[PDB]
Design a protein around this motif. Structure first.
Motif, mmCIF file in Angstrom:
data_model
loop_
_atom_site.group_PDB
_atom_site.id
_atom_site.type_symbol
_atom_site.label_atom_id
_atom_site.label_comp_id
_atom_site.label_asym_id
_atom_site.label_seq_id
_atom_site.Cartn_x
_atom_site.Cartn_y
_atom_site.Cartn_z
ATOM 1 N N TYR A 125 -0.192 -4.682 -2.537
ATOM 2 C CA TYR A 125 -1.397 -3.806 -2.598
ATOM 3 C C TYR A 125 -1.601 -3.151 -1.217
ATOM 4 N N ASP A 126 -1.504 -3.946 -0.150
ATOM 5 C CA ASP A 126 -1.712 -3.448 1.235
ATOM 6 C C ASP A 126 -0.633 -2.408 1.582
ATOM 7 N N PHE A 127 0.588 -2.584 1.094
ATOM 8 C CA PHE A 127 1.667 -1.602 1.318
ATOM 9 C C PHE A 127 1.315 -0.306 0.559
ATOM 10 N N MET A 128 1.009 -0.418 -0.727
ATOM 11 C CA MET A 128 0.655 0.737 -1.583
ATOM 12 C C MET A 128 -0.561 1.483 -0.962
ATOM 13 N N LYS A 129 -1.597 0.777 -0.486
ATOM 14 C CA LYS A 129 -2.778 1.446 0.095
ATOM 15 C C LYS A 129 -2.450 1.988 1.500
ATOM 16 N N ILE A 147 3.053 4.849 -12.679
ATOM 17 C CA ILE A 147 4.196 4.077 -13.210
ATOM 18 C C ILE A 147 3.803 2.595 -13.198
ATOM 19 N N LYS A 148 4.121 1.864 -14.270
ATOM 20 C CA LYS A 148 3.829 0.405 -14.315
ATOM 21 C C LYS A 148 4.918 -0.326 -13.513
ATOM 22 N N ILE A 149 4.843 -0.189 -12.195
ATOM 23 C CA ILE A 149 5.861 -0.742 -11.264
ATOM 24 C C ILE A 149 5.600 -2.235 -11.099
ATOM 25 N N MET A 150 6.656 -3.045 -11.162
ATOM 26 C CA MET A 150 6.550 -4.490 -10.845
ATOM 27 C C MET A 150 6.490 -4.621 -9.330
ATOM 28 N N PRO A 151 5.385 -5.040 -8.691
ATOM 29 C CA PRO A 151 5.335 -5.042 -7.229
ATOM 30 C C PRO A 151 6.393 -5.913 -6.548
ATOM 31 N N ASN A 152 6.899 -6.950 -7.219
ATOM 32 C CA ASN A 152 7.916 -7.877 -6.640
ATOM 33 C C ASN A 152 9.246 -7.113 -6.424
ATOM 34 N N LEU A 153 9.445 -5.925 -7.000
ATOM 35 C CA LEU A 153 10.644 -5.107 -6.676
ATOM 36 C C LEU A 153 10.543 -4.556 -5.245
ATOM 37 N N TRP A 154 9.372 -4.631 -4.613
ATOM 38 C CA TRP A 154 9.192 -4.440 -3.153
ATOM 39 C C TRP A 154 8.869 -5.758 -2.436
ATOM 40 N N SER A 155 7.984 -6.612 -2.974
ATOM 41 C CA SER A 155 7.511 -7.804 -2.211
ATOM 42 C C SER A 155 8.609 -8.887 -2.171
ATOM 43 N N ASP A 156 9.537 -8.920 -3.133
ATOM 44 C CA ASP A 156 10.730 -9.811 -3.095
ATOM 45 C C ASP A 156 11.904 -9.045 -2.455
ATOM 46 N N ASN A 157 13.065 -9.703 -2.325
ATOM 47 C CA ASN A 157 14.158 -9.264 -1.425
ATOM 48 C C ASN A 157 15.068 -8.200 -2.050
ATOM 49 N N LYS A 158 15.115 -8.078 -3.373
ATOM 50 C CA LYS A 158 16.103 -7.234 -4.083
ATOM 51 C C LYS A 158 15.736 -5.747 -3.949
ATOM 52 N N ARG A 159 16.749 -4.902 -3.734
ATOM 53 C CA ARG A 159 16.588 -3.426 -3.606
ATOM 54 C C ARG A 159 17.632 -2.691 -4.447
ATOM 55 N N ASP A 178 1.843 -3.512 -12.335
ATOM 56 C CA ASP A 178 1.435 -4.657 -13.203
ATOM 57 C C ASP A 178 1.607 -5.920 -12.360
ATOM 58 N N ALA A 179 0.912 -5.945 -11.230
ATOM 59 C CA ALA A 179 0.897 -7.086 -10.287
ATOM 60 C C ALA A 179 0.641 -8.355 -11.070
ATOM 61 N N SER A 180 1.450 -9.381 -10.761
ATOM 62 C CA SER A 180 1.323 -10.795 -11.191
ATOM 63 C C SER A 180 0.794 -11.633 -10.027
ATOM 64 N N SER A 181 0.102 -12.719 -10.366
ATOM 65 C CA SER A 181 -0.265 -13.803 -9.427
ATOM 66 C C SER A 181 0.054 -15.154 -10.097
ATOM 67 N N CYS A 182 -0.955 -15.855 -10.579
ATOM 68 C CA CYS A 182 -0.802 -17.095 -11.375
ATOM 69 C C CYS A 182 -0.277 -18.256 -10.507
ATOM 70 N N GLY A 183 -0.252 -19.437 -11.125
ATOM 71 C CA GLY A 183 0.019 -20.736 -10.478
ATOM 72 C C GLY A 183 1.469 -21.171 -10.663
ATOM 73 N N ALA A 184 1.710 -22.490 -10.568
ATOM 74 C CA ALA A 184 3.074 -23.064 -10.539
ATOM 75 C C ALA A 184 3.742 -22.793 -11.890
ATOM 76 N N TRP A 233 -0.143 -15.232 -4.107
ATOM 77 C CA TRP A 233 -1.056 -14.220 -3.510
ATOM 78 C C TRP A 233 -0.301 -12.960 -3.044
ATOM 79 N N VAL A 234 1.030 -12.924 -3.096
ATOM 80 C CA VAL A 234 1.837 -11.971 -2.275
ATOM 81 C C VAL A 234 1.720 -10.550 -2.867
ATOM 82 N N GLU A 235 1.776 -10.392 -4.192
ATOM 83 C CA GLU A 235 1.677 -9.046 -4.818
ATOM 84 C C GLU A 235 0.270 -8.444 -4.621
ATOM 85 N N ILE A 236 -0.812 -9.162 -4.960
ATOM 86 C CA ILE A 236 -2.192 -8.582 -4.896
ATOM 87 C C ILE A 236 -2.700 -8.451 -3.448
ATOM 88 N N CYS A 237 -2.115 -9.153 -2.471
ATOM 89 C CA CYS A 237 -2.465 -8.985 -1.041
ATOM 90 C C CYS A 237 -1.444 -8.052 -0.361
#
Length: 726
Positions: free
Chosen positions: A412-416, A351-363, A382-388, A405-409
């Motif tokens: 990812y660490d939660f999923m693995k 599934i193309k899950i947006m990781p911020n639906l876990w790494s951010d506060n909303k449930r 479909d992890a995002s990173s990018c700058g300001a 850095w929060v989605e790819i670190c």
């Protein structure tokens, strides 16, 4: 700059022919040369279509004021990027030809032969890492060096009647389609067939906006999906173009908080499923009535709101609604997977899950990252990173870090932690651009650091957003100052894959390394608290710069995964399921170590004082008051099981905090491979020593050059070092 760029390109092309004669693997320089050849044509299109680029740059918020200037300077910017890239390629290859840089062997990957094996993509018996680009034209010029990802797109709109007949255009394509290169199947859910909508308009109620524009709990939705899969998957089953699996939905979410982005009320079919879920959760209506403060005569009479209010967070009805929304979404994805498996028993789903639906506060999205990750053969996201961002107050990462850095670190660490033995496939990579971020001058160093770091944390393959350029240089908010205008970014992704391939055994050892500290996670706290993931990030960040992979613990991980860690940390988790506490007790009963603060495990998911408390028994139950104490006890537990790294690293920088994430693996008896990425926003000095004995030498794995025990990393810099002890 056109004449100058063509000159450097011709120079690199002859140097490649000369290096090839000497038996040098020139894949890297051929990739750069091809990038240059492509972007010369794109720059020529840009030069001839200024007006089209004014429009492209106007649509981008930070390039809107200067659109005419940007459209004028774009062609020579692209040629200047090609000149820099040819100068780097020529310098590197001349050093390689003179024996001054050591080039490791690296595979020329034939994507027709790649297979999934456990957590790896395998070519000729070795792990490889794959990069391609969203919507890239599938032509020889673009698939020789820039990825050869195949696949197939379908939609429920391809079911053209109530009988289940499939669009003839789709049958014709599937009958003719070759076995092909490794690929994935994309299931579209935004386009539901008009005949079905006319037959029962209720089928449109309770969508998961915007990517599932129909009711996942409606019987006609299930008929249509069953008919799509039955009529298509028999043509695809076992084929190489399904090897990276079946992608069950693009950025699914069923947000259900009124007045919030992509929110809608659930359907009447969905609320009827809710009454069934409540009956299973509560057993008797008296237990629901006690918690909800209601007087319903039975489960069929439950008749609360079909959408939640933010003010209700913390209440039992709210908890139940969000928990149900997750469970029915999990069941929906289970239904789609079980239908595919009927026609392709080898199918791998994701599934193309947006990781911020876990790494951010909303449930409220109905996205249960643990359940969907566990249920998937391949870890999709479909992890995002990018700058300001191009607007707004600084994000919290901007104080310390070069990028988000929060989605790819952490995600990812939660999923693995959930699924350690699966390929991870980022099906829409947002590590170069988003709707919120854009920088024409994005550095190749940024691009390399991000793909490298994501790969250390488990990433196996990426379809990067996005190759919207057509062969002619025309276009199929996202476009201007994206990779479509950045020759050195497009090239550096493939150059990074080449280097990761060259050390892929080291990379798999880093991905698989023991995660000896597990942060406890429970939906009991994330659903009931406004800001649970602020707390979970605070303890993750606190632990993540000590040379150790940091992972997660849940009830499901403790029950299903080997207990390959030294301690669980429980931080600001005041809400827990009774079954969370019972499972953490069983870990103490096996002589586990649990480090817990004063605030955690006080109530159940309904805020009721918990009947049960953790007892040390045969294990070690350590109560702490501060983050510093929690870290000190966590690292002591690892030292007690002799789990600390064999190389010690200290970092200094002009900030109050570390940014260099580092890892150490054993190469042999007295040699170690050290991985360092500076995630920090300023230069860091790393200082290295042996934990036991003395460092004899430090070299660069990729170059063979001598290094030092003290190194400066610029933001986004990657170090991969061989450290020998005396």
């Amino acid at each position: 700059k056109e004449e100058e760029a063509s000159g450097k390109i011709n120079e690199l092309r002859k140097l490649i022919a000369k290096a090839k004669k000497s038996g040098i693997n020139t894949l890297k320089e051929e990739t750069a040369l091809r990038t240059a050849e492509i972007f010369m044509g794109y720059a020529k299109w840009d030069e001839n279509n200024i007006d089209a680029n004014v429009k492209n740059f106007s649509l981008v918020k930070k390039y809107k004021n200067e659109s005419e200037k940007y459209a004028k300077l774009l062609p020579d910017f692209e040629r200047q990027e090609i000149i820099e890239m040819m100068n780097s390629s020529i310098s590197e290859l001349e050093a390689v030809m003179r024996g001054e840089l050591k080039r490791l062997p690296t595979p020329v990957v034939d994507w027709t032969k790649v297979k999934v094996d456990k957590d790896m993509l395998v070519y000729e018996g070795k792990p490889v890492f794959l990069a391609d680009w969203t919507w890239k034209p599938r032509i020889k010029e673009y698939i020789e060096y820039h990825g050869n990802l195949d696949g197939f797109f379908m939609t429920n709109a391809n079911v053209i009647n109530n009988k289940g007949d499939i669009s003839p255009k789709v049958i014709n394509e599937l009958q003719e389609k070759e076995d092909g290169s490794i690929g994935f199947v994309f299931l579209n859910h935004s386009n539901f067939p008009k005949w079905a909508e006319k037959k029962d308009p209720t089928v449109k109620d309770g969508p998961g906006i915007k990517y599932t524009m129909y009711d996942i709990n409606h019987p006609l939705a299930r008929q249509v999906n069953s008919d799509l899969i039955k009529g298509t998957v028999p043509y695809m089953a076992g084929k190489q173009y399904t090897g990276l699996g079946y992608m069950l939905c693009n950025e699914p979410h069923w947000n259900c908080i009124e007045k919030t982005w992509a929110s809608a009320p659930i359907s009447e079919y969905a609320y009827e499923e809710f009454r069934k879920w409540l009956k299973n959760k509560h057993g008797n209506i008296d237990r629901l009535n006690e918690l909800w403060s209601t007087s319903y005569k039975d489960f069929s009479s439950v008749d609360g709101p079909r959408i939640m209010q933010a003010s209700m967070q913390g209440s039992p009805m709210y908890f139940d609604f969000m928990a149900f929304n997750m469970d029915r979404v999990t069941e929906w994805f289970s239904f789609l997977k079980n239908e595919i498996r009927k026609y392709d028993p080898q199918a791998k789903t994701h599934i193309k899950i947006m990781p911020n639906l876990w790494s951010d506060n909303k449930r409220d999205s109905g996205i249960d990252l643990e359940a969907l990750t566990r249920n998937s053969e391949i870890i999709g996201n479909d992890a995002s990173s990018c700058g300001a961002w191009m607007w707004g107050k600084p994000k919290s990462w901007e104080k310390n870090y070069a990028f988000d850095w929060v989605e790819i670190c952490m995600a990812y660490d939660f999923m693995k932690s959930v699924s350690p033995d699966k390929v991870m496939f980022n099906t829409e990579g947002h590590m170069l651009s988003t709707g919120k971020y854009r920088d024409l001058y994005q550095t190749k160093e940024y691009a390399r650091g991000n793909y490298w770091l994501a790969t250390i944390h488990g990433l196996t393959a990426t379809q990067t957003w996005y190759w919207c350029r057509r062969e002619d240089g025309s276009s199929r908010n996202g476009y201007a100052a994206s990779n479509n205008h950045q020759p050195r970014i497009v090239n550096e992704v493939h150059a990074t894959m080449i280097d990761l391939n060259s050390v892929s055994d080291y990379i798999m050892s880093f991905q698989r390394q023991r995660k000896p500290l597990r942060i406890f996670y429970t939906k009991a706290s994330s659903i009931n608290k406004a800001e649970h993931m602020n707390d979970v990030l605070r303890i993750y960040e606190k632990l993540n710069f000590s040379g150790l992979p940091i992972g997660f613990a849940t009830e499901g991980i403790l029950k299903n995964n080997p207990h390959e860690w030294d301690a669980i940390v429980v931080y600001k988790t005041p809400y827990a399921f009774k079954s969370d506490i019972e499972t953490v007790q069983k870990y103490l009963d096996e002589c586990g170590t649990v480090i817990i603060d004063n605030e955690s495990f006080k109530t159940d998911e309904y805020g009721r004082k918990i009947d049960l408390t953790l007892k040390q028994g045969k294990g070690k139950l350590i109560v702490v008051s501060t983050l510093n104490e929690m870290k000190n006890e966590a690292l002591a537990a690892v030292k007690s099981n002799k789990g600390m790294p064999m190389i010690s690293i200290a970092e200094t920088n002009d900030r109050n905090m570390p940014g260099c994430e580092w890892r150490v693996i054993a190469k042999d008896k007295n040699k170690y491979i050290v991985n360092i990425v500076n995630i920090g926003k300023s230069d860091a000095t790393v200082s290295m020593s042996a934990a036991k004995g003395n460092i004899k030498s430090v070299s660069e794995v990729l170059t063979g050059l001598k290094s030092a025990t003290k190194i400066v990393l610029k933001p986004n810099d990657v170090q991969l070092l061989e450290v020998s002890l005396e």
